[PDB]
Amino acid sequence: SYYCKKGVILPIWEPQDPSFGDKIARATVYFVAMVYMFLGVSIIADRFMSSIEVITSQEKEITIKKPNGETTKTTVRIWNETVSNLTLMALGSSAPEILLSVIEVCGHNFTAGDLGPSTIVGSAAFNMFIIIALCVYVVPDGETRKIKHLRVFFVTAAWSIFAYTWLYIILSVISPGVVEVWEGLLTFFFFPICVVFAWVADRRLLFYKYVYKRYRAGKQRGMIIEHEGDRPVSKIFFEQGTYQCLENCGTVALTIIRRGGDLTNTVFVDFRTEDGTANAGSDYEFTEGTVVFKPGDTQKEIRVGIIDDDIFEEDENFLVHLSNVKVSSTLACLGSPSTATVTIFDDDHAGIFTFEEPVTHVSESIGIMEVKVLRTSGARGNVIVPYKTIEGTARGGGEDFEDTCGELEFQNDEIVKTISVKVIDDEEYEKNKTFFLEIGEPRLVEMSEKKALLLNELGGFTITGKYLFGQPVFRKVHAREHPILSTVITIAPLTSKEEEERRIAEMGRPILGEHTKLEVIIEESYEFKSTVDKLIKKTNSWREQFIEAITSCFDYVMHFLTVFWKVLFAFVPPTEYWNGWACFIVSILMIGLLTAFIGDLASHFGCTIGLKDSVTAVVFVALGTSVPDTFASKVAATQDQYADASIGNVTGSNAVNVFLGIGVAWSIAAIYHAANGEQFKVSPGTLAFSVTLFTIFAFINVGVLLYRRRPEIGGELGGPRTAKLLTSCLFVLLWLLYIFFSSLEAYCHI
Ligand SMILES: CCCCCCCC(=O)OC[C@H](COP(=O)(O)O[C@@H]1[C@H](O)[C@H](O)[C@@H](OP(=O)(O)O)[C@H](OP(=O)(O)O)[C@H]1O)OC(=O)CCCCCCC
Ligand SMILES: [Ca+2]
Ligand SMILES: [Ca+2]
Ligand SMILES: [Ca+2]
Ligand SMILES: [Ca+2]
Ligand SMILES: [Ca+2]
């Protein structure tokens, strides 16, 4: 219409419908005042967001070292991006729309206007489309961003869309045309469910999975934001005369060469093995054979079996004798190296256990660390190595490292085993705390029966089904373990040759190596050190704020253009006072009153031109009051390793807008009206179409965002220039279509 109801603050222009031309003279003043008024919100909401950053920040103390002997004391704070803190920043960034809704309801005798809910729905569509398109385009070329937690995005996106479809439910589906107390109070109570869900999610996400932390410089002077980030007779003789074969080869391949004379001859030669150091039948199979040289053949290959057992022995040798050379159908004479001496190298040492290095320097960012324990010089048997951690300078009670005391078990032919130690991340700027880790005397456990007799073990033996080298593997039973006591079997004038065998076999038990005590020196985290060094390199309070308020030509124009708001908001107390709360109380009022002014302007620029409140809520006020959100979303998209916070801010703001603003405003109106005895009325016809259109387009937006999860695209946000431009153009087109159709239906064109 063309009659204007009185504002909360501003009174009506006394001439009404004056002329076709005078409407311009009033409307340009109203619109210019609104546009210049939005800058005040854009600045004071930034300061309010800074204050609410200060409120939820952990304090840290830094002892800065410099070439002077004295070390300076500096305080830096560490605001951590978490789902709970992003919701508070989103609510803080989303405060103007909530205060606009509350003031719009309360000012006009508790009667709902179009402006309040309509600017919330318009800001919802703006937040979902235009800000996400901007976040798509601001990621630099050659870089992409991916949502680390897709399931968090799902739950949050579903909750965000569910808020608006619930708005449609209470306006049209359930109890149409009215808003009862049980509807508005429930819609308000939905928000604590969201914040408890955020708190539960933050605790579960941090505890369940360790997150690598990266520190970047904050917006303020002394804040360090931390975020999760990514981390010529014929002669017969041996070819060699000396052979070297391991015990576990199974067969040693001897070779016999016939040379000279004539190839076309038939001769017989008999090879038999003879006892040397290695005994026949126990270490080498007694192989006696006869071979014949076919005519035209020079070499003949023979094999001798090597018996493998688990007992440690020294190097041994056995001989091979050739004899009885005969000529079939003198002519054949034996070569000079007739006899061969085969040597067996036993390799049944149980091991030598060493730490890799005597000292390692580590930071707390490693979290769980692995320390190798090398087992050299042998592999046979199964060996337990006890290990423990000793507190040095670093006191250990789970505050600096977890006390681990265990027993490593080295299986057969297992060389490297890892000790897992937990280091608590204190994220201190500089510390040099040390703790030791020591391995005790190792004991062999499982063995064959013959080795058990040779080592003269007396303990209880449980027979295991595993077969090694054709013999059963018995295991010594620890006193803690409780067998049936019927399964266990005790194996339990020596010839003075068997004593020597026992002495040689006794050298096979596991021993310790050179390094038994590893000193781990905990050094400072590299990310925090680099961040603080960069911050120092890049580098009372009332006075400083005032002179910084009053300070290339484009910068001069912008500064002069906003000098009124900067001077006025320099009267806001600095964020150091009252732990930040001094700003928090004073800034929000400076929003509220200011926000009230916007409403009156939006109530009058509509009536002067003849523009409905729904349209001027959708296109003008929604764009003006959502500009504090887009800066946070853009910075979070640009700086983060993973762009979870950028989309999360949009989604949290879109949920918080409804659940706070429409919640408290409509609940207060419903309580007042129901107590007074008159039912509270809201016409759902205009808002129902807009909320349905927003839901339909939000599903498309979510689908298009999920389409970029393919490895061809690269990530959720950014990537190749073509995909960036296509996605941004699609989102801007979607927002344009939304506002065009909503504005057309508001004028009943449909
Ligand atoms: C509306 C009610 C909702 C109730 C459920 C509420 C669900 C909810 O909000 O959970 C928050 C949290 C989010 O974690 P989310 O799963 O989003 O993140 C995954 C995980 O936490 C790690 O970040 C990644 O593994 P890793 O550590 O890097 O190896 C993993 O793989 P990648 O993609 O990064 O490679 C990530 O996808 O936990 C769950 O979702 C697990 C639910 C398990 C049960 C799910 C079924 C209930
Ligand atoms: Ca209802
Ligand atoms: Ca032997
Ligand atoms: Ca042997
Ligand atoms: Ca062997
Ligand atoms: Ca052996």
Residue numbers in the entry: 17 to 247, 370 to 467, 482 to 644, 652 to 698, 707 to 718, 737 to 935
What wording appears in the published article?
Na+/Ca2+ exchangers (NCXs) transport Ca2+ across the plasma membrane in exchange for Na+ and play a vital role in maintaining cellular Ca2+ homeostasis. NCXs facilitate the exchange of three Na+ for one Ca2+ in an electrogenic manner, primarily responsible for extruding Ca2+ from the cytoplasm. We previously determined the human cardiac NCX1 structure in an inward-facing inactivated state in which XIP and the β-hairpin between TMs 1 and 2 form a TM-associated four-stranded β-hub and mediate a tight packing between the TM and cytosolic domains, resulting in the formation of a stable inactivation assembly that blocks the TM movement required for ion exchange function.
We therefore determined the EM structure of NCX1 in complex with PIP2 diC8 at 3.5 Å, which indeed adopts an inward-facing conformation with intact inactivation assembly. The lipid is attached to the cytosolic sides of TMs 4 and 5 with its head group positioned at the C-terminal end of TM5. Two major conformational changes occur in NCX1 upon PIP2 diC8 binding. The first change occurs at the C-terminus of TM5, which ends at R220 and is connected to the two-stranded XIP β-sheet (β3 and β4) via a six-residue loop in the apo structure. When PIP2 binds, the TM5 helix extends by one helical turn. This loop-to-helix transition significantly changes the locations of these connecting loop residues and their side-chain orientations to accommodate PIP2, enabling K225 to reorient and interact with the IP3 head group. The second conformational change is the partial detachment of the CBD2 domain from XIP upon PIP2 binding, resulting in a downward swing of cytosolic CBD domains (CBD1 and CBD2) as a rigid body. Thus, the PIP2-induced TM5 movement, particularly the reorientation of Y226, abolishes some local interactions between CBD2 and XIP and also pushes CBD2 away from XIP, causing the partial detachment of CBD2.
